[PDB]
């Protein structure tokens, strides 16, 4: 009954894309009643591999996959897109410094941001996954004049889910009973997982775990989780990252649970004193495809300091890209 | 909420497993209201990676994942299992042999068949994915006396879905409008995709495509599809194979659509004159953990010829296993 929506996904032939596309086509991201048109973006280098991915999607005989098109042209992949998941980013070449990567990503997201403004739906929902996520998202929306900046977001949902998982583990409770988890700031080592407002079966988390565990165990473990996966599997967390991207888009479009909220890095508008413009992760609720930062939360010294530290790191990142003339 | 069911999966640290486990934990295989307990089996060699997969699963914060346990012991992995997906098989060390391959797989599936018979639920539903699937299934159930042999099956659902995909592409219609596809026999080069009973939008397939295309294009393309993915991606079709596995179990546990059917390789009981005992893919309808071969279908010469060829291949494999004393 519902008309198909167009979903653009970049970095489609990569690891996250391989763990992402099938579940999207299965209807897990936008609903089992919502047909999707997959517009996949790849590079000339990985286009042959992308055709391989297209074949596997076809071989799943998905009833909701109403369209499937692979391309190496952003203007084609983003054409009339209702959703755009920017997973592709600059590769980690040997002898490629931080700044070297910075300018490569600068070109990618400047180009893609401009492509989106030119050919995608004006209300296209954008999620940046490719790192550095928050800053790449900044580059994109700044280069997407004509489009709503708040429609440009970055993913901290994996950090968010990792925090919920750790809290559930420690308390010996179902993760389905963990609510109001928050990861503030940058998707980086300075991220701040907040337990001051989190609840386990309705009870304040800090009534079940102590401050020492929270500070010396919980925070570092959530921050190092990505490395833990690599050290164990010998590969990055593609499947769980894909799951996080799906939930980020899903909750944004279909809405968050009553009494709960999720983490989303979005363009700051001064909430909690966070500098404007930078893409900062905040606790947010969503409804009808729009989200709202959860304000009014009490922020103690412990939280404030960590929130400011990650905010400063983001300001610094913005400073760098701005000096490069990217924005 | 239904009582949790235990799902055992072997070769859990491999490619298909990485594409399979998350969707199962998401409830895509047994329903959104069916909690699942994942019992993962991994060899001593891949256990470190398996622990990494466990972490990623935890990091998805799946509400339906009521349990998660990794082990290298089949008797632990299969304990009280309601379902067992046998994905792990044997490699092919540089310079091996056919009769040699049967030896390694013979030990694997004899052990797992015995483990299932000893610790799994009496009505455990088993699907063999690791190749050679049909023969591995035969070895497994032969070594699981006491357990219903019909509960042991092999996967041809990927061939089935690939066939539906090709027909849909050729006729230019939605794959969702493709029904009554059948893949008979062995999951091998002798597999027989049947178009004589398939319908496209309620219309017989052979009315939209001719025998020339069927024999010269359709059959070879479906048979070579696995190689095509490898040649394009540089990796096997893990995602589409995982999807096929999920659908095989799903349509078996829940049920096939009204007026339609699916392909499942199951122990033959003489249907269509196929030798008893061998695990042969048949067109089948299913409901609540029980399936029935769709008998009474008109089988023309073109079909029987190919049905007999693949049946003979399976007989020879059975004779080989028998000569080795595996069954
Ligand atoms: N924000 C978060 O929570 C996370 C972000 N990431 C980020 O995602 C990206 C890596 O993604 P992944 O799929 O593993 O990578 P791959 O290196 O496999 O993919 C990179 C892709 O970009 C193009 N180059 C190609 O895309 P194509 O083939 O289509 O041309 C290539 O496949 C990095 O930018 C990484 O830092 C990873 C995990 C979590
Ligand atoms: N029936 C079908 O439709 C299909 C069957 N397959 C079969 O599945 C298996 C390959 O599976 P995949 O996940 O790609 O394999 P991987 O080689 O990545 O690993 C599978 C597992 O078997 C052992 N090798 C290891 O188990 P451990 O370390 O635990 O010992 C390993 O983890 C093969 O047996 C292949 O022939 C593949 C595609 C479709």
UniProtKB/Swiss-Prot annotation, chains A, B:
Look up the EC number in the record and give it. Answer: 1.1.1.37
Which GO MF terms does the UniProt record name? L-malate dehydrogenase (NAD+) activity
Q: Name the residues that bind substrate.
A: 92, 98, 131, 162
Q: Which reaction does it catalyse?
A: (S)-malate + NAD(+) = oxaloacetate + NADH + H(+)
The record places the active site at 187
Give the coiled coil ranges: none
Binding locations of NAD(+): 11-17, 105, 112, 129-131
Keyword set includes NAD: yes
Write down the InterPro entries for this protein, in alphabetical order.
Answer: L-lactate/malate_DH, Lactate/malate_DH_C, Lactate/malate_DH_N, Lactate_DH/Glyco_Ohase_4_C, Malate_DH_AS, Malate_DH_type2, NAD(P)-bd_dom_sf
Keyword Nucleotide-binding on this protein? no
Q: Name one GO biological process term.
A: malate metabolic process
* Keyword annotations from UniProtKB, A to Z: NAD, Oxidoreductase, Tricarboxylic acid cycle
Gene3D superfamilies in the cross-refs? Lactate dehydrogenase/glycoside hydrolase, family 4, C-terminal (3.90.110.10), NAD(P)-binding Rossmann-like Domain (3.40.50.720)
Position of the signal peptide: none
Recorded family membership = Belongs to the LDH/MDH superfamily. MDH type 2 family.
- Supply the PANTHER family for this chain: MALATE DEHYDROGENASE (PTHR23382)
Per the entry, what this protein does is: Catalyzes the reversible oxidation of malate to oxaloacetate.
Q: How does it assemble?
A: Homodimer.
Protein name according to UniProt: Malate dehydrogenase
Which source organism does the UniProt entry give? Thermus thermophilus
Name of the gene: mdh
């Amino acid at each position: 009954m519902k008309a198909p929506v167009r979903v653009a996904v970049t970095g489609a032939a990569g690891q996250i894309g391989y763990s992402l596309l099938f579940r999207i086509a299965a209807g897990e991201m936008l609903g089992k009643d919502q047909p999707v048109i997959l517009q996949l973006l790849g590079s000339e280098r990985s286009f042959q591999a992308l055709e391989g991915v297209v074949m596997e999607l076809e071989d799943c005989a998905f009833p909701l996959l109403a369209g499937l098109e692979a391309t190496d042209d952003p203007k084609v992949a983003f054409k009339d897109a209702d959703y755009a998941l920017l997973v592709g980013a600059a590769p980690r070449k040997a002898g490629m410094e931080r700044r070297d990567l910075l300018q490569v990503n600068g070109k990618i997201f400047t180009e893609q941001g401009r492509a989106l403004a030119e050919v995608a739906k004006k209300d296209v929902k954008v999620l940046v996954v490719g790192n550095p996520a928050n800053t790449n998202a900044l580059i994109a929306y700044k280069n997407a004049p004509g489009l709503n900046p708040r429609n440009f977001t970055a993913m901290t949902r994996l950090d968010h889910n990792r925090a919920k998982a750790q809290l559930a583990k420690k308390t010996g409770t179902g993760v389905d009973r963990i609510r109001r988890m928050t990861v503030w700031g940058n998707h980086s080592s300075t991220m701040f997982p907040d337990l001051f407002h989190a609840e386990v079966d309705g009870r304040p988390a800090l009534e079940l775990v102590d401050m020492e565990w929270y500070e010396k165990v919980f925070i570092p473990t959530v921050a190092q989780r990505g490395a833990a996966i690599i050290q164990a599997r010998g590969a990055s967390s593609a499947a769980s990252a894909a799951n996080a991207a799906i939930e980020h888009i899903r909750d944004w479009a279909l809405g968050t649970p009553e009494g709960d909220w999720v983490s989303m890095a979005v363009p700051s508008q001064g909430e909690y004193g966070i500098p404007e413009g930078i893409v900062y992760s905040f606790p947010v609720t969503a409804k009808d495809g729009a989200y709202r930062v959860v304000e009014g939360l009490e922020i103690n010294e412990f939280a404030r300091k960590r929130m400011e530290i990650t905010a400063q790191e983001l300001l610094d990142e913005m400073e760098q890209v701005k000096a490069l003339g990217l924005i």
